């Protein structure tokens, strides 16, 4: 998955 933290 992308990861819930990847955009930070």
């Amino acid at each position: 998955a992308v990861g819930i933290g990847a955009v930070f």
Partner: antibody
Amino acid sequence: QVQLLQSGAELVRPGASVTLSCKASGYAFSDYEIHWVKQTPVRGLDWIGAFDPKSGASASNQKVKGRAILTADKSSSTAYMELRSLTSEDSAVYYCTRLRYFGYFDVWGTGTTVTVSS
Amino acid sequence: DVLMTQTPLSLPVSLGGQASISCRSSQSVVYSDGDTYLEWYLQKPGQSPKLLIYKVSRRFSGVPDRFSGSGSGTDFTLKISRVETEDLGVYYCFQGSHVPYTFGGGTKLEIKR
């Protein structure tokens, strides 16, 4: 030797809470999110939510919102999920699993069998 | 929220044959970075789930060539060729593109011998 250790079983009363723990070893704890997956025979696999130790972010699914609290203790490499106001619908096997950004669920815990019963 | 609908619920296949499992997302699961984070997991009796396919068609390390994933956008398909006895279990698709992530409902492979 990456591994994720969970307690084997928790018996909990209806209306009480349970605390699930996921103790990681064999890797750098902050480099991986911990995700929580509920398994039952008929409803299958159910992504419950996640905690990212690097950014500190958390998320959870719509159904469990308001009842689930996801945290992590970096010093002891342990992620936690607390679930409150349990009913028999919450009885299930709960797995933890790890996720690097843009990666996949490559390593899993062996699962905690939660039984909600008096 | 993004709904993953997997068919069929149970799949008989003769040993040495080929099984086809399909999974359809309710919305697109292409991520802004261009990739589609669609994964296939297998749960064998008495074990934890295990990763088979990530990124619609790429094979996790150790996963034989007989497993091949494909699809696009809305419609995805996992193909098991030359089925062996060890392939028994419940196969699940999974989208990891849009929070909240979601699993398909599962397909239980049934081996005919």
